[PDB]
Write a protein that binds this ligand. Structure first.
Ligand SMILES: *[C@@H]1O[C@H](CO)[C@@H](O[C@@H]2O[C@H](CO)[C@@H](O)[C@H](O)[C@H]2NC(C)=O)[C@H](O)[C@H]1NC(C)=O
Ligand SMILES: *[C@@H]1O[C@H](CO)[C@@H](O)[C@H](O)[C@H]1NC(C)=O
Ligand SMILES: *[C@@H]1O[C@H](CO)[C@@H](O)[C@H](O)[C@H]1NC(C)=O
Lengths: 98, 98
């Protein structure tokens, strides 16, 4: 009778994100972006008067993370699908169902 | 070329780091835009000199439709002329890998 539909992933999206996770993604707005491959941009264009081009033109870069946002979602889905079908036992050995 | 409307008493245009990024040509009264030519970081991938002396080279945040004229390819030794253009070229989000 318990309904875990809003926190488990849905296959319709192109990612493994649940309904709460993309609600959480669309509330952390960025004061500056990261990498949009803005290096073809900022050269020769007139809309180069944002923040990131003036930073990048003085030696200041941003390196990408090692785990993407689609691997962290797989990790938190594998952590959540073991608690439901095993309980407290999968973090001490083998997953015993109950 | 630009869309900037210079007033008739102005010659140059500055930005948030106090560098000229717009100029007026002193013969035809038109407004050009200035942008530095491309740069970035260079990191070397090695398996350790014990195992081999064969390396790979990553060019950060660029494309490799723009690498071999940036690095001094024909100006330098043949040994930097295998890691500038070859058959092993892969495009990743951390720059493209050669
Ligand atoms: C768990 O809760 C969700 C959300 O309330 C239920 O999803 C709804 O399913 C009905 C089907 O009868 C749809 O008409 C609604 O549009 C769905 N809501 C949403 C937000 O998608 C789901 O059915 C519940 N699980 C069970 C087993 O009842
Ligand atoms: C000389 O300067 C004038 C300024 O308007 C320009 O129109 C003209 O083309 C110039 N002549 C040259 C560069 O021979
Ligand atoms: C640079 O590479 C990216 C990824 O392949 C591509 O989307 C972009 O169009 C490229 N820039 C060019 C071809 O000027």
């Amino acid at each position: 009778g318990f309904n875990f539909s809003q926190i488990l992933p849905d296959p319709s999206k192109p990612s493994k994100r649940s309904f709460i996770e993309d609600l959480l993604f669309n509330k952390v707005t960025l004061a500056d972006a990261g990498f949009i491959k803005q290096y073809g941009d900022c050269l020769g264009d007139i809309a180069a008067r944002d923040l990131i081009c003036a930073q990048k033109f003085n030696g200041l870069t941003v390196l990408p993370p090692l785990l993407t946002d689609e691997m962290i979602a797989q990790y938190t889905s594998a952590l959540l699908a073991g608690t439901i079908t095993s309980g407290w036992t999968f973090g001490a050995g083998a997953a015993l169902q109950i | 070329e630009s869309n900037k409307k210079f007033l008739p008493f102005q010659q140059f245009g500055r930005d948030i780091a106090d560098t000229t990024d717009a100029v007026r040509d002193p013969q035809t009264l038109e407004i050009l835009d200035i942008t530095p030519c491309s740069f970035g970081g260079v990191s070397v991938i090695t398996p350790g000199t014990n195992t081999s002396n064969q390396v790979a080279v990553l060019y950060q945040d660029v494309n490799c439709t723009e690498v071999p004229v940036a690095i001094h390819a024909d100006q330098l030794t043949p040994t930097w002329r295998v890691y500038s253009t070859g058959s092993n070229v892969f495009q990743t989000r951390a720059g493209c890998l050669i």
